[PDB]
């Protein structure tokens, strides 16, 4: 169902830290950072190349003042232990040569540039897997009709970007 739950079937703790790992039928590990472009520190959100690494623990937030993430709620996603050079730990989708890319910023980001994510259950069960949506403002109403995918770059980093296809799949493990 459209309810958001972690690997063990538990709802997600609003503000709670999690590992964004792949399910067994995938390559790589958890979500990490990388230093691409002129970035002074790792500011690129990527999927770890190491099948063994849990990645970085991720802070998941919803504006709703509930203890859990409500269904269909947008969420802010950020590294609980961000690098020093990032103004805040929130992920943001920015324009770039590789298409819309998920990055950290050296500048404070208006809430509208971080409140841009939404999880989505993946129909079949056995594993509680979810895809990630990138949402945009049509002024009043917010729409989430675009997924986040993986785009391996020249240096091998599996960048998280808004891709036409090759959708990113996640299983959330409590940290």
């Amino acid at each position: 169902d459209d309810d958001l739950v972690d690997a063990e079937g538990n709802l997600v703790e609003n503000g709670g830290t999690y590992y964004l790992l792949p399910h067994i039928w995938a390559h790589g590990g958890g979500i990490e950072t990388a230093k691409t472009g002129n970035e002074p520190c790792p500011l690129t959100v990527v999927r770890s190349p190491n099948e063994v690494s849990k990645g970085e623990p991720i802070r998941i937030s919803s504006q709703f003042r509930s203890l859990f993430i409500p269904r269909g709620s947008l969420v802010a996603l950020g590294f609980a232990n961000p690098p020093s050079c990032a103004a805040s730990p929130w992920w943001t989708v920015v324009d770039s040569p590789q298409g819309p890319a998920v990055k950290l910023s050296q500048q404070k980001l208006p809430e509208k540039d971080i409140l841009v994510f939404k999880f989505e259950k993946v129909s079949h069960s056995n594993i509680h897997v979810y895809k990630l949506l990138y949402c945009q403002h049509d002024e009043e109403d917010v729409k989430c009709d675009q997924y986040i995918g993986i785009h391996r770059d020249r240096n091998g980093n599996r960048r998280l970007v808004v891709t036409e296809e090759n959708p990113l799949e996640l299983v959330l493990l409590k940290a």
């Binding site: 609003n14 509930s66 947008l74 509208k112 939404k118 002024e139 109403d141």
Partner: protein
């Protein structure tokens, strides 16, 4: 609730608690058969705990009644947090008394600057974690619509209104959702959302109950 105080047992008789194993959302008793909480607080096994104070101990004046129905506003939009209101019909009628009493619905919307009482068993200190055993209270004035929209760029609809303090330190928080916001003995708001808790220029945003009076009187008379 952050920057608040301990209300006092059964001092907020209309304050209910939604349980699904533990407490997850507040709620307001509007009559012995219905409760009003938030739309994002919808679950299908809600047990309503009435006449509560210490939600972790049985102090003896509680009432546990399941929900037979849970009706989310037909126009609720999770993506925009708009129309965040829900109606819950108790399986059996709640015994009304001094420890468990319903709260009145509004006839007219509230005016900015009006002082209200926001309560709940939410996080008491946001910039860390600490959740109260006993119920907490907070006196918060409605804030001007302009400063509300200015606080949350492109997010405020007419079904929303801010309240609290633009300096921070006193606001509601995670856990208070669905709870009550009473002004002059009237239920004006429902704890809904906000960016963080008690942050500067980040006041609590509440569902503007007054816009749903006809929908509520219409729902209670059909189910």
């Amino acid at each position: 609730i952050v920057g608040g105080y301990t209300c006092g047992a059964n001092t907020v008789p209309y304050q209910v608690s939604l349980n699904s194993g533990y407490h997850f959302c507040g709620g307001s008793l509007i009559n012995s058969q219905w409760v009003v909480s938030a739309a994002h607080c919808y679950k299908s096994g809600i047990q309503v705990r009435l006449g509560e104070d210490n939600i972790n101990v049985v102090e003896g004046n509680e009432q546990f009644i399941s929900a037979s129905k849970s009706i989310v506003h037909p126009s609720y939009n999770s993506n925009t947090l708009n129309n965040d209101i829900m109606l819950i019909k108790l399986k059996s009628a709640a015994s009304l008394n001094s420890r468990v009493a319903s709260i009145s619905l509004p006839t007219s919307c509230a005016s900015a600057g009006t002082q209200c009482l926001i309560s709940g068993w939410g996080n008491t200190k946001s910039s860390g974690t600490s959740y109260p055993d006993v119920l907490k209270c907070l006196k918060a004035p409605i804030l001007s619509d302009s400063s509300c929209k200015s606080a949350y760029p492109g997010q405020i609809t007419s079904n929303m209104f801010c309240a609290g303090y633009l300096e921070g330190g006193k606001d509601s928080c995670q856990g208070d959702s669905g709870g009550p916001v009473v002004c002059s003995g009237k239920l004006q708001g429902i704890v809904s959302w906000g960016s963080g808790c008690a942050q500067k220029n980040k006041p609590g945003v509440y569902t503007k109950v007054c816009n749903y009076v006809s929908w509520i009187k219409q729902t209670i008379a059909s189910n």
